[PDB]
Amino acid sequence: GRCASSRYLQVLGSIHDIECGFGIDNTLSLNLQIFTAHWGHLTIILIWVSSNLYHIASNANYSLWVKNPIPSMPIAHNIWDPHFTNSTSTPYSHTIITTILIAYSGIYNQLYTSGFNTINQIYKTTFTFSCLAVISILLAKIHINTHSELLHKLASHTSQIPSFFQLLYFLDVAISSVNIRFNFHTGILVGLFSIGYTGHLLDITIPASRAPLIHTSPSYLTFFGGLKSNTSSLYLTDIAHHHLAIGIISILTGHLYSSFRAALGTYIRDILYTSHLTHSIKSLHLALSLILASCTPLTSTTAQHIYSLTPYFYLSYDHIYSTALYVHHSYITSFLAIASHAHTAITLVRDWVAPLEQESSSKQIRIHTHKAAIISHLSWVSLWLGFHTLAVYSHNDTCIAFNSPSKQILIEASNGQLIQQASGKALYGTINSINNYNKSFDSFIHPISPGDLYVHHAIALGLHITVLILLKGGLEARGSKLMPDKMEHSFGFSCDGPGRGGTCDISAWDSFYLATFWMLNSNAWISFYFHYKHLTPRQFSESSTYLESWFRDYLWFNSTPLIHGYSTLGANDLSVQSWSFLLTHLAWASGFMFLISWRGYWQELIDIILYIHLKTPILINLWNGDIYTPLALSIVQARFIGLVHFSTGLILTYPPFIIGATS
Amino acid sequence: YTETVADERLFEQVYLQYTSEYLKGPLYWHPDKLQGWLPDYPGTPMIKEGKYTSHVIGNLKAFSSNELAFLSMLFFGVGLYGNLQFNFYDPQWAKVDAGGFFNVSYIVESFLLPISFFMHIACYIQRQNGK
Amino acid sequence: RVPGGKRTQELGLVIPMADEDGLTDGQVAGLFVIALVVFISAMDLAKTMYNGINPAKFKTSKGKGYISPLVKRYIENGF
Amino acid sequence: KYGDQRKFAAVLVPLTTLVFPAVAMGMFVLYSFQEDAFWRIVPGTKRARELDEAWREHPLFANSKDPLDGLINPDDYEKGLEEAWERAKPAGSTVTVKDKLKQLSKQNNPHWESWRAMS
Amino acid sequence: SHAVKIYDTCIGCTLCVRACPTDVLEMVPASINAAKQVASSPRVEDCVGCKRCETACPTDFLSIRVYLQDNEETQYSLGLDLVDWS
Amino acid sequence: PWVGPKKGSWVKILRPESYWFQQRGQVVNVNQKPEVKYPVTVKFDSVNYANVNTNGYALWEVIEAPAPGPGEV
Amino acid sequence: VVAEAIPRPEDLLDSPKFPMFEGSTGGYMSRSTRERHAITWTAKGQAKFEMPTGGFAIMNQGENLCYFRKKEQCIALGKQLRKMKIENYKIYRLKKDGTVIFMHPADGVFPEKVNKGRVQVNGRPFTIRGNPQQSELKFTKYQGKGYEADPLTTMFVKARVMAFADVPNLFALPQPNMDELVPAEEVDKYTRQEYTTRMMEALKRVQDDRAAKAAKSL
């Protein structure tokens, strides 16, 4: 016997699930594979950085954008596509000149702020980052060899006593050690990296931004505030001082755990054992979940503070950079946030040992004892938020459709206004006690209106429901009342049969699949809020309390330039935006059939098609189907493929709209 | 005699009661019994008798309860003085804004408040153990 | 270029293009040499990851292995 | 001129987006018919057996798959268990610890990992 | 091939055996219930995985449990008709 | 000598995977054969997802709880 | 039980045992499949029935014989026949070589009827919840198959779960002395039974040292 066509999907669904590998027999192999994969991924990141730097160096106009950044537009890379018109000139080129694309990433402001002035510096930087990619791959090879050499040194290893087998658990102490990793991460990788970047700023960035000054004196460490007037960005001296302070704090903190000597520092196990934790820190899924849950606030605050307090030169002067960066980082942090819950569920399925029935000692145990209370209260708050946001929006829509704008229910956002007032009083007290006052903070505090209150309630509803689905999946991954053996099965499995009431979407993976739709919807709400307030603050402040305003004055109204891109009147430089808009609509709708239509129909359809192929004159004498038997996609594969189509469509439909509306 | 289900359950209970006691001993050697795993470090028991042992406070395990109480109250006074003399009374912000420097004594002292909190925690832990 | 979007037309935003080349062919070739080095090393790394660790090397491979003196300390310092 | 980099594009773009992808797809469909294909996720491949046996040949990982591995002195454990069962043996029960454990280890699951018979 | 396991809670319904569409299950004598019989799954290589046996089992939680193994599918566990894997 | 709870006596279910875990149900009958592993038969007012309101439990999964009372499972 | 001599369906064209059936495209796909399942039965009257592969059929008053690609179709037809009070039907799997394997009434008694000599295959001696946790059996014989564990392993891991919750009374495993142990494997003292005595004395020394160290500030 052999396999069917579903082998490809089955293999690719766990192609990186190194725990599911067949040759892997021990944590040594798993940890070494993960470490080597980390090295390869770092190489990929470095090559990507070098790629962007090269294309800015070669197929771009950094040397000219740096001179007049406010009205100029950067170039991403050239367009070489043989499908364009070999005659005339495309709307993306100045007549006979080559074809170009406008960069919406923001690397131009990054390099300008960091101190780049010439193309030659960018070329040297590209070369150095390619060198670093080589170094990373060679480090991967080095560590593979060192661990294989330890394994070979077990050919000259014996304790002369039966305790020699204890060495089995310490072979991967290089990777699995936690105290040393925490100490050196928090100290070196955070604090000293910040201190080195402060040195970079003081040596290059501040010297290459103003007239020549003293030999990088300590007057380069200022405490001004935000939004230097000329470049509309944070003071580079303030940034250097901030990185210096963070570096000092994290360097001091990095001396906490017992890393290299047994006589200094406290152990993480003893820290947890005397607190409300003591979790299984040897689980890789648990660590991954709680560090993905750490990159999530970091990325969300990155999205918030790149816009609110623009740190790069002339970044606020670009109407497309500011929206694209915020939306990108919001989507990245939403993905990481749902990742944290997905891997928490995988941790509970795979890497969690629980007491017999009643020992309420582990934190997961105490959570599982009253998990029903958690889920019931999360459902209650989700229901309240949904009911009272949709109902008030419906009131506003109905009363404004009935020619009565004054009959709306507009709750003044008093709590957010109080927080803003307190923060503004603090900031104004800071500013008034300065001999160099009249500072600006850009959008750190923004006008808050009833529309803001309603949108914040909608966002809270989305977050609550996403957390509800993910938390329910995590807590009932090991067993629910409907299926009280769920931890005997895989993390993702089809169903439990039509009996016992019917059990579609019962696995924890199915809970993740359901929660990804809500993650996408909440992110869409957040992005729509930001983009609408960005396009017209006045119209958002007044007419955003009724959903018809969102439907008309934002979606229908702002989609005018994009659809007009390519038509029977000529093309604009938004032609790619409109074409990708339609393509992403097609991708989004194509995944509906993988979600709505389920397997058996298609399996019968595939049986009919296979009947045809085994009935066609020439095919039957070459291919009997016994080798790679065509079969319909399995249930979990179908749900995942539909989810991928839906996610791709929903995500990639937005950047064309952003570019058409802002540019 | 035939092995009734009650007899099988009795064997289950006997086996579990014996083995759960045996595995705690020095003769099972499971990876969950390593240092940094569930069991306490050899010479440093953290929790015994449902009370924080003296080894919790690390290098302060040899300190007396009276010494820790005095250090806790002294550090609380000094740190609270530093915080109040840095924030509200004798503000340093205007002085440092015009090119001056912080009163370094205030900065050093203000870090003694959380130190005092944990010092009084350690004082209570020492008092519980009779040290 | 034929601009699209209201703001580009109503503000006069323009996209300057350098009349020079950017990078000469020699610089591109210099980058491609190191890119090829990355490529060869990455193919080797992919092979090694695909095949995984070989534990049976101690029966055939020469030498006797080695544990660095710090790795021993890290082993006996704890976990 | 601002062009003259298109001399690189006219070779690289057709190459890496047509020749390399087609060669990769052909090589992948060829690899799909090897006996080693997807040996890490597909059960019953020869290389998986060789890797498992190679792991078992290592002196550290000989008794690694045994769930009961760890008992430093299994004879002491068995003797203590037998002594504890003797004082709790119900009346004239005829079951010993040795055969009880022997029959509790031997289950009947013929269709478990039967895919270890082709490669 | 899937994995069909029978647990001690079986009460000799024979409903699981009757519901199986590929004769995977059978009744064997036993002494752990008033019916003096428990189910067995000697031929799970023919178990398609329809889980009708689980639908038919009336114990509080199923005395018969079918564990799906998709990376394990054989021609019999897939119900292949147009194609032979032998 | 009768073994297990009396007939018609309410018992609280201690089987963790049972649909009626920590619920209560009347004892229909208790099988007196020592060879039967799950002799206690309990019927419930609330049916499970299989629309079955009765199940057989082990001797160590019923604790002889009082009557449910008003508005109590 | 005596297996019949069911010939290969490609060599028994026009047999008197074949019931009168309409014939459809649902039959087994020749030119691509060589494994066929055959079901035979003896009827009393020519009662019309439904073929599992579409189309109806009329049995013969004597012997009957049908060929199908899948065992499921044969079992479906067997249930349909048994509803008509037709017992004594046998289902055979035909190998490509022509080998006849007797499948459905394997011991001659239908599986819903208890027959002596059968043994509970794939039986587990506990409630379904009694299976060991998947997390406990990582990188063992049952890496992701906790439901396949033998009951002894389930009891062992249950006892381990019971033990590894009384943290204060656990025994921390001593750290190996890598630098001064670990000679060449040929450098061993043999004396295996003495090695356990060395284990006993070394662990006694470790425990005494730990007790002495603990009795300093505790």
Ligand code: CLA
């Ligand atoms: C927009 C979304 C979308 C799309 C594209 C399809 C497409 C299809 N559905 Mg479908 N379906 C959808 C949504 C969609 N469905 C939804 C929401 C449901 C609700 C459950 C269903 C329910 C459904 C059922 C129940 C059935 C179908 C069927 C079909 C197929 C018949 C049409 C066909 O063969 O045209 C061809 C497919 C196209 C997409 C046309 C465009 C093809 C492109 C434009 C040309 C080729 C591109 C080119 C080669 C690029 C190469 C790729 C690139 C990587 C190089 C087809 C694959 C039927 C079927 O399969 O019967 C034959 C069928 O029975 N669908």
Ligand code: CLA
């Ligand atoms: C006797 C009626 C009754 C009572 C006292 C409660 C009480 C409660 N429900 Mg509830 N519920 C009910 C009926 C009832 N429910 C019905 C019929 C449904 C089906 C739609 C629900 C669906 C439901 C959900 C989905 C949730 C609750 C929740 C809750 C709790 C928080 C309060 C809340 O969310 O209310 C809001 C209640 C609703 C949104 C449901 C609609 C209210 C119905 C229509 C009232 C019907 C009353 C009935 C007709 C009275 C007839 C009297 C007459 C015969 C004499 C609380 C214990 C939440 C929870 O567990 O958090 C702790 C929660 O998440 N309920």
Ligand code: CLA
């Ligand atoms: C599930 C309930 C719930 C949730 C999750 C939120 C969530 C949120 N509210 Mg909010 N709010 C609620 C109910 C809720 N609200 C109710 C019932 C009212 C009264 C109409 C308000 C009035 C309100 C205002 C005026 C503002 C917010 C704001 C906010 C946001 C900032 C957090 C904050 O300060 O909230 C405060 C925390 C709460 C309100 C929690 C109270 C939860 C209780 C249980 C709700 C029921 C209370 C009950 C009706 C009181 C009856 C009194 C009666 C006996 C006399 C956040 C998204 C701010 C915002 O978005 O500004 C941008 C803001 O300015 N809320």
Ligand SMILES: CC1=C(/C=C/C(C)=C/C=C/C(C)=C/C=C/C=C(C)/C=C/C=C(C)/C=C/C2=C(C)CCCC2(C)C)C(C)(C)CCC1
């Ligand atoms: C000889 C010479 C030359 C030539 C050169 C060449 C021919 C080049 C080419 C080059 C090339 C053609 C390159 C390419 C590259 C590519 C790359 C660089 C990629 C990479 C990737 C990576 C790195 C990643 C990877 C991975 C994956 C994805 C899978 C998994 C694993 C890993 C992670 C590894 C000249 C005359 C000029 C000069 C002189 C010298």
Ligand code: SF4
């Ligand atoms: S249906 Fe369930 S309880 Fe009845 S005989 Fe089959 S396995 Fe046993």
Ligand code: SF4
């Ligand atoms: S899943 Fe279906 S084929 Fe398998 S044993 Fe149960 S009833 Fe029979």
